[PDB]
Amino acid sequence: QRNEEKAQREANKKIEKQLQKDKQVYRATHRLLLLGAGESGKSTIVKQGIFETKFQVDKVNFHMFDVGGQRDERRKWIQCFNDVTAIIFVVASSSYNMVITNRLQEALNLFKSIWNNRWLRTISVILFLNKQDLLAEKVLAGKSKIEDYFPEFARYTTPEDATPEPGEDPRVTRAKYFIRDEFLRISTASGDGRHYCYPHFTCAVDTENIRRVFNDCRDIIQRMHLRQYELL
C-alpha cells in the first residue's frame, strides 16, 4: 500500500504547485461588480446568466462581473460579492421624473440597501451618474421641474465648494449636485470609514471611465491599507 500512498503524495505535490501558480494569478487580478439598474445604462459602461468582462489598465488586471437578468427584488446572491475590490453602481440621473415611485428613488433605495448590508460592511461603491446630457436637456429646456418629484430640492442650494464644468449652466449644476448629495447622504450616514462612495458624473461619450475606475480602485486599496495601520 506504500506505492499507492507515494503516488497520491506525488499527485498532491503536483496539485499544490498548480494551486500556487493559480494563487499568484488570482491575487494578481481585481474583482469588480456592476450593479446598475436596467435603464441606467450598464450597456454603455460595459461597452468600454452572468456576464464577465476582463479589462486591464497599467498592467493591472480587472474583472468586472455584471449579473445578467435575475430580476428579483430580494438579492441573496449579493453575499457572494463580499471580496470584490469595489461595487460599480450605475444610476441614470436623468430619470428623476420617470415612474417605471420614481426611477431615481428606486435607485436610492437600492443604494441604501447595498450600503446597509451586513456582508457588504467593508466593500466600497463607485457611483456613476450616467446620462448627464439627457439630465441637462431635461433640466434646462424641460417644463417638468425636479422640485415636483423631489420636494427637498426647493430648500437646496448649490455648494459653495464645487467644480462646475467649463461650459455648463447654473441650474443644471444645481440639479447635478443635488442628485449627487442624495447618494452622498446615504454614503456618509452609515459607514464609519470602512467603505466610501466615489460619485462620478459620467456621460455616454466619456471614454475616461476606465481611468476613473482604476484611480478609484487605487484609492480604495490605499485607504484600506491606511486604515489597517491606523494612519487614517
Binding site: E5, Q8, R9, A11, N12, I15, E16, Q18, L19, D22, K23, Y26, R27, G49, I50, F65, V67, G69, Q70, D72, R74, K76, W77, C80, N82, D83
Partner: protein, 331 residues
Amino acid sequence: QLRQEAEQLKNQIRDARKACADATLSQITNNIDPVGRIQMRTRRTLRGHLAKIYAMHWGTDSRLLVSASQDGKLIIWDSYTTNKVHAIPLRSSWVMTCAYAPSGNYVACGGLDNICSIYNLKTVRVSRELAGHTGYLSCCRFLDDNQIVTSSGDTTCALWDIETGQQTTTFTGHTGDVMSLSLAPDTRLFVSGACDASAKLWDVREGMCRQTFTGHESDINAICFFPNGNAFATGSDDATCRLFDLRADQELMTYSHDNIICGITSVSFSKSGRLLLAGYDDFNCNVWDALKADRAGVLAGHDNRVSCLGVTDDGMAVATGSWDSFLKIWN
C-alpha cells in the same frame, strides 16, 4: 371567490394540524436521559482553497469529499491522508453548490451561471453542462449516476436526465428562491426550503407537492432530512432550527436560544438522529440534541462564517467548511 376558498382551506389545514397535537415532543422526551456534554476536536484541517467555501459533500465511502469555492476550483480531498486527489478548475468562478455521486464516478457543481456542470472523475472533463434554469443554482443532489436534482433561484426545482440533458420533470408552485435541498434515503421523496418561510415536500416520480410546512419566519438557508425518513430539520435566518415531521405535518421542536441571534447556514443529522449539528453566522457551529432541544456542544475552530456542514455516511466524522477557506473535520 377563489381567495375565500383558499383562506377556508388554509384554516381547515390549521385546524386539522391543531387536532393532531396530542402531546409536545418535549413532554414525551423529558423523561429520557440527556446526551450530556459533547466535546469534538479538529482531527484534520484541509488547506488549499484560496477564497471562501460554500458547499461540500461527503462521498459514499466516507473517505473522499468534494468542496467548492469562489476560486473556480472543485478540489476533491482524501480525508484520511489529507491529500488532494483531484483539483478541477471550473469555467465560472462563482459557484454555490457541489455534489458527489453515490457511485463516486461523477461530481456536479453550479452557481450564478445558472448552469449545472457534471464532471466525470473516472475516464476530469465536463461530462455534461445542464442548462434550463432561469436563476442561480443553490443545491444539487444525485439520485443515481443518470438522474440529478437541482434547486435554482427561479423558484423552481428540476429533475434532470444526465444522458439526455433535459428536465424530465419540473417542480413548480414555489414562491421563493430555493436555497437548500435534501433527499430521502429511499430517493422517493425530497424536500426544499426557499426564501419564503414555507418548506415543501415533493415526490420525485409524480412531480407534485405532497405537503407544505411554514413554521419558520425568515429565509430557509439550510435543510436536512432525518435518517429515519419521517422527519426533516430546517435552518433559517431567524436564529431558529425546527424539526418537522412528514406524518404529523407540523413541527415537533424548535432549536433556538436567546444568546444566539445569527442565522443558520447549514444543518445536518448524526447517524442515530440524536444530534442535530447546525452551522451559524456567529463564526462557529452548534451541536443540538434533536430530542430535547438542549445544546450539547460547540465547534469553535473556524475563523469566518460556516457555510457548509456534513456528516459521513458511516457517521464517524463531521466536516465543516467555512468562508476562511479552511475545511475542518471534527470527531
